Design a protein around this ligand. Structure first.
Ligand SMILES: CCCCC[C@H](CC(=O)NO)C(=O)N[C@H](C(=O)N1CCC[C@H]1CO)C(C)C
Ligand SMILES: [Zn+2]
Length: 170
């Protein structure tokens, strides 16, 4: 199916994804389910932590046409500067909440793809924003954690009320 997307404040959003040991039948099903779940939501990124899988797996497609899929496995991201570029973000695990967040602007990304081909690229703008955001997810981090603790407290509430009306709707 398409999988449930976990929601703030669920404490399974804090689990530290463990790495992947090999690409088996299951991890391929999951990378495929996740793409569906991400395109369905809709969104441009997804970490396995968000659909209750604490494994270092990230899918992504940035295009308007929903046609440039990307698949990161045991990634590693290094900041190439202290020059944080601000960026209005939102999260599927944090619905209808948005504010500005500062992260490094230039970043190196290292990982393998679905078939295990290694790549190692240098990343700008939205790619570099998206990747850091999904990496945060794998290490139990939400973009609200970059905010003042009341602006996030109020976000525990806006979301809990949203989910209430998700449930009364479903
Ligand atoms: C820039 C951060 C991108 C992270 C990817 C997320 C998906 C997610 O919640 N992953 O953890 C997304 O598509 N979020 C969207 C989002 O934040 N957007 C829309 C596209 C880019 C960014 C601008 O607000 C939705 C929720 C509105
Ligand atoms: Zn998110």
């Amino acid at each position: 199916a398409l999988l449930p997307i976990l929601s703030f404040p669920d404490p399974r959003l804090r689990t530290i994804a463990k790495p992947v040991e090999e690409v088996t039948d299951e991890i391929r099903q999951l990378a495929a389910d996740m793409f569906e779940t991400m395109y369905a939501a809709p969104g441009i990124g997804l970490a396995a932590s968000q659909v209750d899988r604490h494994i270092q797996l990230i899918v992504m497609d940035l295009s308007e046409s929903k046609d440039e899929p990307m698949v990161f496995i045991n990634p590693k991201v290094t900041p190439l500067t202290e020059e944080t570029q601000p960026y209005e973000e939102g999260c599927l695990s944090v619905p209808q909440i948005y504010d500005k967040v500062d992260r490094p602007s230039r970043v190196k990304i290292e990982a393998i793809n679905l078939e295990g081909q290694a790549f190692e690229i240098e990343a700008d703008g939205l790619l570099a924003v998206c990747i850091q955001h999904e990496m945060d997810h794998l290490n139990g981090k939400l973009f609200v954690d970059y905010l003042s603790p009341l602006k996030r407290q109020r976000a525990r509430e806006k979301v809990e009320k949203i989910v209430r009306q998700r449930e009364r709707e479903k």
